[PDB]
Amino acid sequence: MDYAGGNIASLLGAPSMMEGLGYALRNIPVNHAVATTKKNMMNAIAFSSVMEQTATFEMGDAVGSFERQHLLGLAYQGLNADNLVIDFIKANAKGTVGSVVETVIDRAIADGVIVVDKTMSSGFNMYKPADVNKWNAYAAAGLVAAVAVSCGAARAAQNVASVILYFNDILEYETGLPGVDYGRSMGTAVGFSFFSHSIYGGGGPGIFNGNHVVTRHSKGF
Amino acid sequence: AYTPQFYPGATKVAENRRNHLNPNYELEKLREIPDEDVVKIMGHRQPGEDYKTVHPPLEEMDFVEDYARDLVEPLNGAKEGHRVRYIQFADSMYFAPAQPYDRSRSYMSRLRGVDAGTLSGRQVVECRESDLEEFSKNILMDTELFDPATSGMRGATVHGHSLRLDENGMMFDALQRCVFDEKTGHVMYVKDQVGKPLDAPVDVGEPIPEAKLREITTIYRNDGVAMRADPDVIEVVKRIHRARTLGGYIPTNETFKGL
Amino acid sequence: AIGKKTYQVSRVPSLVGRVCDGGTISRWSAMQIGMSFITAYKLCAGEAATADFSYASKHADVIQMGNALPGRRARGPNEPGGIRFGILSDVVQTTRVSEDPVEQSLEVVATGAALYDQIWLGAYMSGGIGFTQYATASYTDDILDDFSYYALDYVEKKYGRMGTKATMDVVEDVAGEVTLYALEQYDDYPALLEDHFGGSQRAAVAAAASGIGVCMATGNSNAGVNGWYLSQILHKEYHSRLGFYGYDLQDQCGASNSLAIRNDEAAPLELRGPNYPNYAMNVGHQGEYAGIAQAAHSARGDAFALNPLVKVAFADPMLVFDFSKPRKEIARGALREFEAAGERDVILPAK
Amino acid sequence: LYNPDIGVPLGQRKLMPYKLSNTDDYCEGDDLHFLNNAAIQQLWDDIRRTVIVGMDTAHSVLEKRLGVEVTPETINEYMHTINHSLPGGAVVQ
Amino acid sequence: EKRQGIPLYNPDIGVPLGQRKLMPYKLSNTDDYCEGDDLHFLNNAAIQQLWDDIRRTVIVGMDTAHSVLEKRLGVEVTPETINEYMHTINHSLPGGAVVQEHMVEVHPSLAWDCYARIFTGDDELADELDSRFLIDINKLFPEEQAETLKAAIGKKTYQVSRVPSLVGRVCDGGTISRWSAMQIGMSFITAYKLCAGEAATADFSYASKHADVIQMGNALPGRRARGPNEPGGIRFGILSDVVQTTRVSED
Amino acid sequence: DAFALNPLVKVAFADPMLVFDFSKPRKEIARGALREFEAAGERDVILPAK
Amino acid sequence: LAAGKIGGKGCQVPGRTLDISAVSNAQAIADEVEKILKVSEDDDTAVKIINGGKQ
Amino acid sequence: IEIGSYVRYINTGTHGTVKAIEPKNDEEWVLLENDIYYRPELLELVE
Amino acid sequence: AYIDVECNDEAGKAIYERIIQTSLEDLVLGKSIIKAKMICKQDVPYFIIGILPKSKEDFIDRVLDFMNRVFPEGMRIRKTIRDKTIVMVASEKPIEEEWMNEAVKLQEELKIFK
Amino acid sequence: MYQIIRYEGGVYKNNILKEWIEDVGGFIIQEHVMQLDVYMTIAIPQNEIENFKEEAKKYKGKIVETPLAGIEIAIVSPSLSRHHLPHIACDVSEYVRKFGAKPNMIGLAHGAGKNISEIREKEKRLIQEHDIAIYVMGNFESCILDKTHLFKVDIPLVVTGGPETLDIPYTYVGNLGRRAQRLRKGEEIRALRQMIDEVTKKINDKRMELSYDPPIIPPVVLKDEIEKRIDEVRGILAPMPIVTQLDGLRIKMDYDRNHEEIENVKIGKYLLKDIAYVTRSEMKNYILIKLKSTSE
Amino acid sequence: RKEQIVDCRAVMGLGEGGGLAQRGTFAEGLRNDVVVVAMSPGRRHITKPVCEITYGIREAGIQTSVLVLDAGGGIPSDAPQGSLGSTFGLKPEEAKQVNRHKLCVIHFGNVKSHIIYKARLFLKYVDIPTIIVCQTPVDMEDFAAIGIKTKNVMPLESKTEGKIVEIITGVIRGESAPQKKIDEIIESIKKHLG
Ligand code: F43
Ligand SMILES: C[C@@H](OP(=O)(O)O)[C@H](NC(=O)/C=C\CCCCSSCCS(=O)(=O)O)C(=O)O
């Protein structure tokens, strides 16, 4: 019940071969998005983000209280709203993932997105979000910027899993704040790591899509 | 701007973790291993010969015009086109100076264009070969991040992170890459990191005294510094857990009032 | 719970499920039920009422151990990937022979490990060695037993078996205390550390103890998994290591998904299973999840967790496997003194 | 003095037997493999081969559609029949 | 003995069997007779093994793996290395664990039917390989049939993995492919020692156990929900190819 | 024709190491009906003799 | 919800019992669902009451 | 059997050419192209 | 397989039943044998072991290995009779005719076992 | 004075513990390193027992009280064949070893059968050279009762057999007959513990009779002195180069080549030949030392 | 028929319900004729394939010693591209304990490339004829291909002073060895011993 040995193809797979209900739109792999946009970074990011967030709207996830968070995620991660991604990349041209985390926290503090919760006995003034959804959007934009910085420094696409995982880790244990998608981004990064970095790994990062058991956990982030 | 803290806590373990995470903190160096010796232990290339390439130099190859992609300055190994290699370390649970997740966080905070992976008894970082050798010699091997007894550069068979130390205080090794020379009191690597023997053993210094290990370690232990003695880290972990739970339940400002 | 209703339990031969797959069982039972009905009441061999009997027995009144997994998973019914945690809790019969809630939860943990981690993830979705030392870590030595008994003692000293309502603060308190105690025990006794040499084993044991303690404090299974995930992310900071990379996928998404209400993420832990999207790849979680689900009800002294019919059906004394004491039966099988069915020696030549 | 042909002993703990929790039996680690343990295989087999059927709709259809009266004696006869038919015995044809 | 008085087989209930003469059954082209009960698939071990052999068969092509090893991984591939890999996979496929005594392994007598075989349309590589675990097309098929099969196959190398029957007995048919892939990956990373990084190992894993896998049957959708390597997914041409009478008969 | 749909399956099932020889399925079914067929998958070494 | 009949055929989870009055508050529930599902103002979003709020 | 002949090992089938015959310990031995001694009784002539 | 021991010693009966079971398991002979009866006569040293197989020479060799494993060490003089039922008498003394008669009685009793 | 115990700990910092034992005057009788854990049978003065317990708990070690770690036991199987050797006999030997004793498997040449069983004089003397002998018999009451002539040695005796109760004029432990499985059931473990208790009682009685007239020098310190003086004892390839018996030692070196060196060893101010009976052993031509009492 | 006394090891076994032997230990059979070498005290080597050969030899009338190697698992460090998983080795005291016996019997596993190099390292320090008991069908000559002295297939450049004197195939680890294999081993020992 599929088109296996045929010579006719489409971007969407058979609806009976979906990971879950409403998962049809998360079937375009990363390589297809990159090839369609002719290897343009911002356009490929916009394509992937648009598809993922439209799918989240289709899956019923972006309904009621989650619609604002998914809209902000789309605007700030895919469409470069407020120029956050470009600003972070420019500020960390020679930087690392930690410097990207620092710039993200500085921008969030300057914009009023996060405030100081309390200062513990051993210093470490805790941070709480004055705007939870906006903080998630800022963290997602910073995640994209960190991936761009690290993979432009290495000029290799094998760093994505580690960059996302440890960006979220460093941010969480630097601010006391939740990461992108409240740990779902970190879990999906662990999935990427064990899917593309071992003999029980399979394939590379170019064939990642949301319609897989390994990469379905983050709702378009 | 924003002056970054790096880790909560007041104990010595939290301070050491902060020091590892801090890129402006100069790690104290405890040995001098020549670059060629580090390359020999690494076992990827013969010292003195040129680096193998995976693609032509970035100037030779033609790429489409990409303003955002061109904002980031590439590594020299990327500029020339070198193969991506790895260096792997195993850390003992008995007061090793560096620990897997601590190593990965410090690597991603201090180095550019690195791929760090964390396991319970393993930690590997991948980078272009020239830069990988550079920061392996400068940071990974010569500084306090490495102890020749409780830690070991080793690929292939890794086992002994949870086992007890041997009679010389060295971590268990199923391949015996490094042995203890009692005449000089130094640890010598008789094999490279994957297991093929070296023609000339390389002196990697002598084991760090246990008193210094208690001070420079990044692990929490009942016999050493316990997490119960550091309530600040536990509070931050619980705050992260509660924030994750509240965000996964309903991500609004009203549900986060119970944070 | 059952009411004034009559049920029939059909146990088709094990050889049938060994030659064929697990989807054969319901159809086998349905055909034999239909034949027995038409021949016991002297009815016509084939009419409309025969179709009514067939439809009833094939789907209207049938109870399957595991649901089918069509699509990507591609599996039939009565497979270990379709068995929910509450169903497996009801399969274990320690609740009717013992009053110790920790013992009941730990027998369910042992059964869940031996089923999920060893069969479903060891061979159904992997191969070769499988995951034996990953699962035996939860039922070989008393490490998990000692941690769970400490959790129960700590809960009873300050909360009681049901003395508190499930809130965030009690989850943090119980899970953190149990995790700290378990990691201190690992530090203090090198024998325990060398027994659970892999980080995954240790993380699973400590988190299972923390979740069992939270369940014994609150009586809610979702609070139990929340405590499990807090224990995992506290273990990670305590030892700066959790397990093999690829282990903490569900543990990083867990805290958010434990109390979620979204369609793909919400499910009571009794209704969760190996087909839950987060739980559907990684070893060292599912058996302990089933144990936490059971402990949610062992705290209340409940007769069953999800299905009374499953509990009554597996209380049958004629079953080949004794589900009252799963660990004893596993030990008997390990010593080559367990008689198993499904063997075909009457139709085979002498060797 | 360094002799590379001495070797490294390994796996001392894995050689020792594994106790079983709440029991008094010691077994090898190889015998706890699901392929080498018939008890685990039977544990899975018993769950796999179990199906519960509610015999109330069938009784109602026998009563209201076929006009056949259902009594405990008839249920006993049905149980006797199905215990012969379910393993694979012949009842008609 | 076993049922403690619960009745199992009662010929007295139901139809009175044997009102007519219960005929014996011949078997076509064979001079032996048997009762009809002996031909039931549950009472006949031959039919059960017929299904077992088909269920536990997965064919994996090893040419992308060799090319990835040679070029990307920088490891030479020779007939001696192929023989070493075949030894490794033959030890490891049933239950084995290579140079690891601490790891739990399946009892060897429990999987005596497990084999890993190799065949290729390349003649020189075929005669350079060990005959212990090679399926020789030239000596198993007639000359014209062997030529046709070599032309259809090409100059490529394939390995056949026979997962032990017990694995299919305990589990379902979808277990066979995963078991084969896992053991193939372990044997490949053990025989050939590679000092490359782990991403390269992921590419090699795809090339070695997910690039040219041939399954006996496909998964079934809807109410026939089943995994691969189940009898409902086997096409008629595939079953015709399974039977080997074109080899030994011209009728 | 030497094969019908897949040459690889035809070559793979010509293996002499198979327990069931597909060259003569009728003969092997006859052998199995006579209780003279040695099948695999029996757990004789992990079960008690009594 | 009143009997904890979550799970499916013959399934009960003791302890997970909620006492709500959905049928009595059917109008409020329908209004809230309409507000949540509405796209802008004038879409074809309708939640009608059937059988006195029973459906 | 002589130098330049073609021989194969019966136990495995290794093809090679005889290099020299080097008796030792009042016993005949045969050296093949792979620099391995063999036994004449375990070798036979092929053409 | 069916295991029964005819002895007037209580401990010997159970211990040698376990010995027979273990010897059957070690050789993997449990499913290939219908019955295995052992007659223990220790006052006059001689033991009889009878085997009724299910339905080649390798199986016979395995059966004689089973007899060698089960029989006591001191009983070295042994003789066997095989007419589809293998029965062997072991004693430290030359085998007497009455012992052989008991062996044939056991053989005929095992033949009609069903 | 010198209570002998077993220390079970790790090899890390074990040299410092050995230095402490040497400082307080103890002797390391046995040492074995498996992979990372070391088992040490140590004899230390009784006045330092609590100090050594404290020191052991500092290294996270374990102290196991071994009531038989000063004796060597002759386990007499009827033969070394598959009937007795690979099971029961090894279980008896290993359980004896678990309490510190040094066992020796004695497989009789003609020990099998009912009326054809016999014991040679050389085997008799070899058995008598030990401290206590354990007989592993069969599981038939008549066979054992018609086999009493085997147990004729003037050594403490414990007879094990199948039947629960026997009527022999010796100590008997039942439910340990000829088997073919590893002894792991509860009843079998209980019977092994009963045999251990009987041999412990006999050894304690013999220790009391020896303490009535103590020897001039303890066997353990004599072994230490021999090791310090004789420089060929570290070249011995035997399992236990010097065996500590109840009232003597067994030196596993050639008697013809080394008896003169052994005798001319000065302990304190005495020569060894004047305080001990150095004689050739029936055991592979080794050297057997029997200590004299203070009465002579 | 003569008395056979064995010097039992000085250390106990592996726990309560485990094996009776201990790694890195030696049990002399007084009169040194045959030494059986076990790679480990585990169930894969001890009492299933090793003590059976031991009691077969002891039944044949030949005294036997059993030596459990300290590090018998894995492949030697001199194997191509080093060892993996674990390192095989032989101690000088173990070599001396082996070398005082007339003959040696050693039990190997299933992978040929492991067996050949393990035998080469073993015979680098053992100078008595040895018998290889393995499961896989291995040929006398593949040992000579890497420079091992062999009775039928000598190497041009011998890297070992020990002679592989017989290879016996069909003995599986952890499984009871049938009487036929024991008889073959006994016949080979007798006809290469006296
Ligand atoms: C030896 C390998 C190679 C590889 O690809 N996977 C291995 C081996 C693989 C094989 C072992 C069989 C074999 O022949 O290789 C299998 C069975 C894979 C599977 N099908 O599940 C396995 N491991 Ni692994 N593996 C395990 C474990 C572990 C622990 C060991 C910790 C230590 O420091 O000693 C770590 C993971 C971690 O770092 O967290 C581990 C690693 C490794 N594991 C790395 C380590 C070396 C490498 O870098 O290549 N295993 C354990 O933690 C216990 C459970 C155990 C699994 C089998 C069992 O459950 O019985 C086995 C599970
Ligand atoms: C979906 C699949 O992941 P994949 O798509 O990356 O193969 C998923 N997991 C796997 O990677 C496959 C098999 C499980 C292997 C895990 C063994 S844990 S022990 C090895 C630790 S190490 O090798 O990482 O060091 C599964 O099939 O269960």
Residue numbers in the entry:
A (entry chain E): 168 to 388
B (entry chain B): 2 to 260
C (entry chain F): 203 to 553
D (entry chain F): 59 to 151
E (entry chain C): 52 to 302
F (entry chain C): 504 to 553
G (entry chain D): 57 to 111
H (entry chain L): 10 to 56
Original paper wording:
The enzyme responsible for CH4 formation is methyl-coenzyme M reductase (MCR). MCR enzymatically reduces methyl-coenzyme M (CH3–S–CoM) to CH4, with coenzyme B (CoB–SH) as the electron donor for the concomitant formation of CoMS–SCoB heterodisulfide. The structure of MCR has been thoroughly described as a 275-kDa heterohexameric complex with an active site that contains coenzyme F430, a Ni-coordinated tetrapyrrole cofactor sitting at the interface of subunits McrA, McrB and McrG, arranged in an A2B2G2 stoichiometry.
To reveal the molecular structure of the MCR activation complex, we vitrified the protein ‘as isolated’ and after incubating with 5 mM ATP under redox-controlled anaerobic conditions, before performing cryo-EM single-particle analysis. Our analysis revealed two different assembly intermediates from the ‘as isolated’ dataset. One map harbours the full activation complex, including the A2 component (58% of particles) at a resolution of 2.5 Å, whereas the second map represents an assembly lacking the A2 subunit (42% of particles), refined to a resolution of 2.7 Å. The A2 component consisted of two ABC family domains arranged antiparallel to each other. A2 sits on the backside of MCR binding McrG through electrostatic interactions, without contacting the other activation subunits. Our structure revealed two ATP molecules and their coordinating Mg ions, indicating that the structure captured the enzyme in a pre-hydrolytic state. This finding reinforces the basal production of CH4 when ATP was not added in vitro. McrC used a flexible loop (C138 to I168) to bind DUF2098, whereas a second loop (V72McrC to K95McrC) wedged into the N-terminal helix of the more proximal McrA, which became disordered and created a groove towards the F430 at the active site. Around the heptanoyl chain of CoMS–SCoB, displacements above 3 Å (more than 10 Å in the ‘as isolated’ structure) of loops F361-G371McrB and K244-E249McrA′ enabled the CoB moiety to freely descend through the active pocket.
